[PDB]
Amino acid sequence: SYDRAITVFSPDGHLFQVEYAQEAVKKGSTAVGVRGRDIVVLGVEKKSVAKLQDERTVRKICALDDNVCMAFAGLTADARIVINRARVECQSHRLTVEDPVTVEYITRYIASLKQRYTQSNGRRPFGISALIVGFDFDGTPRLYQTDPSGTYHAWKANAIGRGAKSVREFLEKNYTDEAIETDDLTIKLVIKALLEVVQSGGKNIELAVMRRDQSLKILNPEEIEKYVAEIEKEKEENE
């Protein structure tokens, strides 16, 4: 029993809590993600690992089902509620309709979760921003995004976290279909984008792909070094 409105209007015509919530997304680690026609890719930066500690619990890319993949920013406690909320719904969709869940259906579930959660009384709004990646039936790879207000879109290359606009600028002068032709070219492109933001000393990048046929595979840290080396080799030919 708590009857207290928290989110109200402003005299100029805005809100307060949503703009305060998107600052928490702005104070978070960056995570980008591109797509293609056959395989997808998404990565995350700013590991900042203590290098003496465990790291199987620090994973910030998860999966809702055998198609749908996650990548968030913002704070971490509020992300965990959203994920365990979404795993239930994509499992209960499979209960009634015998399909795999379409990636568009689950993003409407998260966005409608978050909108009624800013609407009601006594409730602090969420502080995450997810990247939802999955290839539906008939082989349609796509990626959506969320917002703490509860809106959602379809992008071809997203960036969030601490300093996305530089990454959004770096992806802005990168409008090539040829980079979305070869698979390893797309992955080094994400590594090229993530190294443009983070200091990226070969141990702060966690990328993961999905070939629209199999569950996601975290690449090996040798392959992160293998892709960064060929990124350094192809960039050294500027003369």
Partner: protein
């Protein structure tokens, strides 16, 4: 800077409902015209990035089979009203075997425009334009976050609100035709927008008495622009 949320002004108006009307003005513009041949309807998408896929963004949303919509303001606050407006037509058809009329839809929507409180939240932040064909011909209605339901002949809302209405009263009469009302609207649009008019920034949806299934895509849209 924190008074009550449910408090009359000393002048007599309300506080937060007054602020809700102001939040519409920063939204995307939209134009609708009622004509006896049919109701047309126009909107601007306002794409922010080429990476963003355009067709995931919509403003025209169908309601039952013959009733369209047009939102302006906040996106996700409108999706609550849209889903309810769809259901209440189905409650009407599966209790009466007839289509709920366009006026009587908007009555059902506007009931919970001002039902916020502590017992039994905040006012919504979207204006709407319902248009369709019922037994009384083609109709076009307008509502607001104050729940003030009204009928207009050709209303234009969004950011370009005052300049759009003034240019629209300039050229409008009772005996319009449908193709005339379509090409008149986009002339108003490309005067009030900031990008160029193409197949990706605007979209139309026209409902006729015969073609009740309102249906408008690109490659007819490109035909409309190149003929004007």
């Amino acid at each position: 800077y924190d008074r009550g949320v449910n408090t009359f002004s000393p002048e007599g108006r309300l506080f937060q409902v007054e602020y809700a009307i102001e939040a519409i003005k920063l939204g995307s513009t939209a134009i609708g015209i009622q004509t006896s041949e049919g109701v047309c309807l126009a909107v601007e998408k306002r794409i922010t990035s080429p990476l963003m896929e355009p067709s995931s963004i919509e403003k025209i949303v169908e309601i039952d089979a013959h009733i369209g919509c047009a939102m302006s303001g906040l996106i996700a606050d409108a999706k609550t009203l849209i889903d309810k407006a769809r259901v209440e037509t189905q409650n009407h058809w599966f209790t009466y075997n007839e289509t709920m009329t366009v006026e009587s839809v908007t009555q059902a929507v506007s009931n919970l425009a001002l039902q916020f409180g502590e017992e039994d939240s905040r006012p919504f932040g979207v204006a709407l334009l319902f248009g369709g064909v019922d037994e009384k011909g083609p109709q076009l209605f307008h509502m607001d976050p104050s729940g003030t339901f009204v009928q207009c002949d050709a209303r234009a809302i969004g950011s370009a609100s005052e300049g759009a209405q003034s240019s629209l009263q300039e050229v409008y009469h009772k005996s319009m035709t449908l193709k005339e009302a379509i090409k008149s609207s986009l002339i108003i649009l490309k005067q009030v927008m900031e990008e160029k008019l193409n197949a990706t920034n605007i979209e139309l949806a026209t409902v006729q008495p015969g073609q009740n299934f309102h249906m408008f895509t690109k490659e007819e849209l490109e035909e409309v622009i190149k003929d004007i």
